[PDB]
Amino acid sequence: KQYIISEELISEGKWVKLEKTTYMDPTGKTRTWESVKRTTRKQTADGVAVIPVLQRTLHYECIVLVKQFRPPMGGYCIEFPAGLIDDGETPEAAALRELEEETGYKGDIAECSPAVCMDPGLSNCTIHIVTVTINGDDAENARPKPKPGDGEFVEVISLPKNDLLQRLDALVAEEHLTVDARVYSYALALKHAN
Amino acid sequence: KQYIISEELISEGKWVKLEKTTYMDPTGKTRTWESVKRTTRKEQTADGVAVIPVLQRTLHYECIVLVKQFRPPMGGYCIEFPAGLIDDGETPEAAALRELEEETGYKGDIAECSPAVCMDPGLSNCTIHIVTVTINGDDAENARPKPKPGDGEFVEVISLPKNDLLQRLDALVAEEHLTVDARVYSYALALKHA
Numbered sequence A: 001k002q003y004i005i006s007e008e009l010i011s012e013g014k015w016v017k018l019e020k021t022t023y024m025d026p027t028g029k030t031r032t033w034e035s036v037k038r039t040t041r042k043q044t045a046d047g048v049a050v051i052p053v054l055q056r057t058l059h060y061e062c063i064v065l066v067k068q069f070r071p072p073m074g075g076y077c078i079e080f081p082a083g084l085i086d087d088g089e090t091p092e093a094a095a096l097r098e099l100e101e102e103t104g105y106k107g108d109i110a111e112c113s114p115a116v117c118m119d120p121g122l123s124n125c126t127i128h129i130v131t132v133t134i135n136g137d138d139a140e141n142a143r144p145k146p147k148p149g150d151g152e153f154v155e156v157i158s159l160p161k162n163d164l165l166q167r168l169d170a171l172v173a174e175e176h177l178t179v180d181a182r183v184y185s186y187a188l189a190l191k192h193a194n
Numbered sequence B: 001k002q003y004i005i006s007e008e009l010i011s012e013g014k015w016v017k018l019e020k021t022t023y024m025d026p027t028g029k030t031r032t033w034e035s036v037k038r039t040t041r042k043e044q045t046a047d048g049v050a051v052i053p054v055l056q057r058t059l060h061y062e063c064i065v066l067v068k069q070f071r072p073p074m075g076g077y078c079i080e081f082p083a084g085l086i087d088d089g090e091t092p093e094a095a096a097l098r099e100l101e102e103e104t105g106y107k108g109d110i111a112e113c114s115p116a117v118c119m120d121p122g123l124s125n126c127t128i129h130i131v132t133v134t135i136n137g138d139d140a141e142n143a144r145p146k147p148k149p150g151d152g153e154f155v156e157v158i159s160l161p162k163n164d165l166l167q168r169l170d171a172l173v174a175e176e177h178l179t180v181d182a183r184v185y186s187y188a189l190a191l192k193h194a
């Protein structure tokens, strides 16, 4: 019933563009929408986000997260490790690479989502969500070496999977941080399950 | 360590604006970043709410109530938690209950309400509260629930069993072109991982 008729560039930055989208509503009335897109896409998706499950024997299983200054938020956020997929990179390879660069950990692919939307009322942005295990007892993960690109500044925070939501709430309460909505959603379902 | 220096408008639409943000990096160097914001954000704790609606009925498995809509930024249909913008002066809880009834017909009961969480913090300042709501599906109010779509709103309801949510989302995606929302997929993945 619904579909795009045309797009009009409103403004294109180096990294972000703002469009005016004309679409057919399901009555047959024509309507307009203000949409954002990244100018970086080729790609299955703009990005990957990594769910990293740190497995060490005789310890709680942890989910490995990153804290970083996010200029659009004007603040520090807590997020899954994540970045854009390089032209001609697979989502899985992007994941293992972003995970290493942001956390120093070397992990294994457990599963990989289709392209999922970030904020579909605003943007066309999409990611692959990639579940990765990290064998924390392996020598390559003993003193994980985080190799960040130019200008990345990333603090690693590992939290126990079985208390993740309470742990995230405490961080928010003490530290004036913003937790990411995917992180929060995953943490909520951990509590809601069964 | 890091902070915003200045935010310079690049282009303002009716609903979204694009800004050059100038910030202090943790080396002491000035850097820039293009950032998206809503135009309308007033005194709300966030732009929006998304509702995790747990439909409970005697001798049924619990369902998660989801919505399917055309999303002009995506150019296609998306499957999401029911969601909408917080009206000026409205509480996240009232906005969540209202949006759930408008989009699905159900009348829910508040269970919990998250802090403001970021939607895509590398891109925008957008935030929501994630509000968990239980729906008493045995109540007559919720028997033949009629959606009250707003002007230009056109929503289908999809209720999927909590205990098989991810497999049921995969089956929907395998059957048509649509995109699952990243917070929905994250929630479904955590229900599997727990």
Ligand SMILES: Cc1n[nH]c(C)c1S(=O)(=O)N(C)C
Pocket (backbone or CB within 6 Å): A032, A033, A034, A035, A121, A122, B015, B016, B038, B085
């Ligand atoms: C109408 C429209 N265009 N772009 C967006 C975003 C929207 S909106 O209804 O979601 N809104 C005012 C934030």
Ligand SMILES: Cc1n[nH]c(C)c1S(=O)(=O)N(C)C
Pocket (backbone or CB within 6 Å): A015, A016, A038, A039, A040, A084, B032, B033, B034, B035, B122, B123
């Ligand atoms: C550096 C920058 N600023 N704003 C954005 C968005 C970016 S980006 O190049 O990282 N990108 C397209 C995701």
Ligand SMILES: [Cl-]
Pocket (backbone or CB within 6 Å): A053, A110, A131, A133, B193
């Ligand atoms: Cl796992």
Ligand SMILES: [Mg+2]
Pocket (backbone or CB within 6 Å): A081, A082, A083, A102
């Ligand atoms: Mg990153």
Ligand SMILES: [Mg+2]
Pocket (backbone or CB within 6 Å): A082, A083, A098, A101, A102, A148, A149, A152
């Ligand atoms: Mg990186």
Ligand SMILES: [Mg+2]
Pocket (backbone or CB within 6 Å): B082, B083, B084, B099, B103
């Ligand atoms: Mg909505």
Ligand SMILES: [Mg+2]
Pocket (backbone or CB within 6 Å): B083, B084, B085, B099, B102, B103, B150, B153
């Ligand atoms: Mg609505």
